[PDB]
Amino acid sequence: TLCIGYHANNSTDTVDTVLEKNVTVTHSVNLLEDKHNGKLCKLRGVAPLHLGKCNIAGWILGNPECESLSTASSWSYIVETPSSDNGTCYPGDFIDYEELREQLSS
Amino acid sequence: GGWTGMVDGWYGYHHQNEQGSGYAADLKSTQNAIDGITNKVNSVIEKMNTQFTAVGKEFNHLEKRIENLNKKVDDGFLDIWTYNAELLVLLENERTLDYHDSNVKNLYEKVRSQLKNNAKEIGNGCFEFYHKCDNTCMESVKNGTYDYPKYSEEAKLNRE
Amino acid sequence: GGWTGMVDGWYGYHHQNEQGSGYAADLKSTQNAIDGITNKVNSVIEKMNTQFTAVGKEFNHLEKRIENLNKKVDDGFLDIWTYNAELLVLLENERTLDYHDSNVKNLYEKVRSQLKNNAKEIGNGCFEFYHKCDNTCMESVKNGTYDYPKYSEEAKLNRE
Amino acid sequence: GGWTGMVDGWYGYHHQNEQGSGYAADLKSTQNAIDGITNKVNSVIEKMNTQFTAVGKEFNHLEKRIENLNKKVDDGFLDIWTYNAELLVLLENERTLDYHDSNVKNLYEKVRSQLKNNAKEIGNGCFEFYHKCDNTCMESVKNGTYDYPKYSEEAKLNRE
Amino acid sequence: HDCNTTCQTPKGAINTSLPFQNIHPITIGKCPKYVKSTKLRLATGLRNIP
Ligand SMILES: *[C@@H]1O[C@H](CO[C@@H]2O[C@@H](C)[C@@H](O)[C@@H](O)[C@@H]2O)[C@@H](O)[C@H](O)[C@H]1NC(C)=O
Ligand SMILES: *[C@@H]1O[C@H](CO)[C@@H](O)[C@H](O)[C@H]1NC(C)=O
Ligand SMILES: *[C@@H]1O[C@H](CO)[C@@H](O)[C@H](O)[C@H]1NC(C)=O
């Protein structure tokens, strides 16, 4: 006797289809990324400008507490923390702040 | 069901005869199936060519309507991609499984075509020979060269 | 053509023999077809999961460019959804109809496989028995248990 | 392979017999195939109904965030359409080719059904008659009217 | 960190090339599209029925 068959294995991977659900298949790939490395990286070869505890207004105006920040010659993006509270120290209206932030972003 | 003992390709044959037994992958079929699947997966990924973008936008408290427009834009794109992606996966998974089912169906028919009236169709992909079919005979069938006329006399004598 | 008298499922059999006649749905096939269709329809609807939104936006007479941008956004989304929806419906309707055609084709082949040389393939889904095949015989065929060897003598005697 | 000499339709027959030889398109099949393809192509084009729009927008140097939003909108729409269009073309081209393969497969089966045991299935779409089958006989087969019983005596006598 | 990427999100950089991601809607770079889905598993093989 000669018989035609197919491969089976120990895969427990299942997929869904339009007609049926939980179909176990022998080989499977993702189209979806659910991992990241937990790090802020150089983007396209260029390091970000991290401002520590300062925001952009603080950094560009020279808030005394932003004095310790280094000056970057170039950067790919700007990073501020959720706690980047040191901005304008003498209260007032920083005009067209959002446009300035966009211009300095890269 | 499949053979958990056959790990040299997706499709293949198993046999038992007077001289021995075992299995081997049909690599003509398996490689064609692989090229098909590989091209399919790659097209799904390789065609979606994006550019450098920056998604986030910043607005002040008197620009609520603009921020909301920006959200509207993000939401529409998100719903479109999520939905289309789910349909693409579900549709392709069904097509993939049919493709695989097609390739193995094709192999059965090729064997049946060569064997004609010299073997019984019994099931589980099996053709029961009505004549002695030794290792040389079975390899000849798998390779598309079964010389049907030299086995037809024996096949009928074992049935008459 | 179909049977307007068969309303107990999508697919089924009709017979005529010495002991009587009638029809019944093949509920193995019909239920599988139903689960297939049900999952398909539900995936089309159930995967399109939206959030709470507010579409309308208001702009003044010196914001014409923004209102026009908002329109541009609505129009692009509208064209995408309308077009994709039309293609989805047209594509699925063809696939649906092929699926149904597949399921009934499969039943024909299962019957043919059991009957082998004991019935003639005549058409209109019909297998003409070459031997007496009473109600017990026909139920056995429909259920996948036809005991072919006990009918092969009669089938050949009625042809010799 | 196909016939470069057959240019009167997509599908058809070629024959050789005692009275002559040649080919002709099967226009029942070809026209149905054409209507299928025509409807398919037209639906792809005809359903994508756009309105009058104006894409370009102008912003000043203090509106960079808005210009960038406008770009974001154009880019998302562009990626969606480019990708979906590539998938639509690749998917339909495979379905188109399967459709064509289906239609010619169907013709083979219709011929086989009529000929039954009066011809050998040899390959290259060919049925070798076991009896004389002149031009009238072959036209009868192509038209679905082969009167099988009048040829069965000759077919068996040439084999006994 | 002294690392490099093609796509960056606030939770960390994405190293990878598949068409979709479910990590974060706001990204900078040549990024996968954000989806709400938790699984886009595309079969490459046949049904695993032994
Ligand atoms: C689909 O399967 C999901 C994963 O569960 C696995 O397969 C099912 C069929 C069960 O055998 C289960 O024990 C396995 O872990 C389920 O979470 C899911 O609920 C299943 N169907 C759905 C989506 O409801
Ligand atoms: C990216 O990092 C690798 C080390 O993993 C290094 O070899 C390469 O030069 C870096 N590229 C750029 C543009 O800095
Ligand atoms: C991460 O990036 C490096 C290049 O620095 C590349 O060699 C590696 O394959 C990437 N990892 C993944 C999972 O894509």
φ, ψ for residue B122, nearest 5 deg: -105, -35
At B153, list the tokens.
């006399």
Cα maximum dimension of chain B: 97
CATH assignment of C12-158?
A: 3.90.20.10
Would the CB atoms of D58 and C73 count as touching at under 8 Å? Answer: no
Q: Is the Cβ–Cβ distance between C13 and C24 less than 8 Å?
A: yes
Nearest ligand 3 atom to the CA of E16 is 14
CA of E16 to the centre of ligand 3 (A): 7
- Parallel, antiparallel or unpaired: strands A23-24 and C20-25: unpaired
Chain centroid to Cα C74, Å, comes to 38
Please state, in angstroms and rounded to a whole number, the distance separating the CA atoms of residues B69 and C138: 67
Closest in B43, B53, B54 to D90, CB measured: B43
Q: Is the Cβ–Cβ distance between B160 and B140 less than 8 Å?
A: no
- β partners of residue D44: none
Expressed in angstroms, the distance from the first to the final Cα of chain D is 34
Chain centroid to Cα B44, Å, comes to 17
Helix (H) or strand (E) holding A77: none
| AA identity, residue D42 | N
What residues have CB less than 8 Å from D85, skipping those under 6 apart?
none
At A101, list the tokens.
């932030």
Q: Is the Cβ–Cβ distance between D133 and D151 less than 8 Å?
A: yes
Name which of D70, A25, A102, C13 is nearest E50 in CA terms: A25
Chain centroid to Cα A75, Å, comes to 15
Instruction: Assign C7 to helix, strand or coil.
Output: coil
For ligand 3, whether the C-beta of E6 sits within 6 Å is no
* E1 in a labelled binding site: yes
Query: What residues does each domain of chain C span?
Result: 12-158
What residues have CB less than 8 Å from D106, skipping those under 6 apart?
D29
| AA identity, residue D103 | N
Distance from CA of E28 to the nearest CA of B (A): 5
Please state, in angstroms and rounded to a whole number, the distance separating the CA atoms of residues D100 and D106: 10
Q: Is the Cβ–Cβ distance between D66 and B67 less than 8 Å?
A: no
CA–CA distance from A26 to each of B2, B22, B37 (Å)? 10, 22, 13
Interface test with D, best of C62, C70, C74, C80 (most D CBs within 10 A): C80
DSSP string, C48-65: -------------TT-HH
- Parallel, antiparallel or unpaired: strands B11-17 and B20-25: antiparallel
| AA identity, residue E21 | Q
Instruction: Assign A44 to helix, strand or coil.
Output: coil
- Parallel, antiparallel or unpaired: strands A32-33 and E20-21: parallel
Q: What is the DSSP letter of B19?
A: T
Please state, in angstroms and rounded to a whole number, the distance separating the CA atoms of residues A88 and A61: 8
What residues have CB less than 8 Å from D158, skipping those under 6 apart?
D130, D131
Would the CB atoms of B53 and D69 count as touching at under 8 Å? Answer: no
At A58, list the tokens.
């603080």
- β partners of residue E5: A43
φ, ψ for residue C34, nearest 5 deg: -65, -45
| AA identity, residue B11 | Y
Query: Nearest residue on chain D to C80, judged by CA atoms?
Result: D81
Q: Whose CA is nearest to atom 5 of ligand 1?
A: A22
Q: Is the Cβ–Cβ distance between C39 and A21 less than 8 Å?
A: yes
- Parallel, antiparallel or unpaired: strands E28-29 and E12-14: unpaired
Sheet containing strand E33-34, strands side by side: A32-33, E20-21, E33-34
Please state, in angstroms and rounded to a whole number, the distance separating the CA atoms of residues D38 and D25: 19
At B66, list the tokens.
């603009």
φ, ψ for residue C124, nearest 5 deg: 55, 35
Q: Is the Cβ–Cβ distance between E5 and E13 less than 8 Å?
A: yes
Q: Is the Cβ–Cβ distance between C72 and C49 less than 8 Å?
A: no
Name which of A73, A70, A72, A78 is nearest A50 in CA terms: A78
Secondary structure in 3-state letters for chain D: CCCCCCCCCCCEEEEEECCEEEEEECHHHHHHHHHHHHHHHHHHHHCCCCCCCCCCCCCCCCCHHHHHHHHHHHHHHHHHHHHHHHHHHHHHHHHHHHHHHHHHHHHHHHHHHHHHHHEEEEECCEEEECCCCCHHHHHHHHCCCCCHHHCHHHHHHCCC
> Which residue bears the tokens 């479109």?
B80
At C7, list the tokens.
């309303």
Instruction: Assign B131 to helix, strand or coil.
Output: coil
Residue C68: count other Cβ atoms within 10 Å of its Cβ. 14
φ, ψ for residue C131, nearest 5 deg: -140, 160
Please state, in angstroms and rounded to a whole number, the distance separating the CA atoms of residues C56 and C63: 15
φ, ψ for residue A23, nearest 5 deg: -80, 120
Please state, in angstroms and rounded to a whole number, the distance separating the CA atoms of residues B23 and C43: 40
Please state, in angstroms and rounded to a whole number, the distance separating the CA atoms of residues B24 and A7: 11
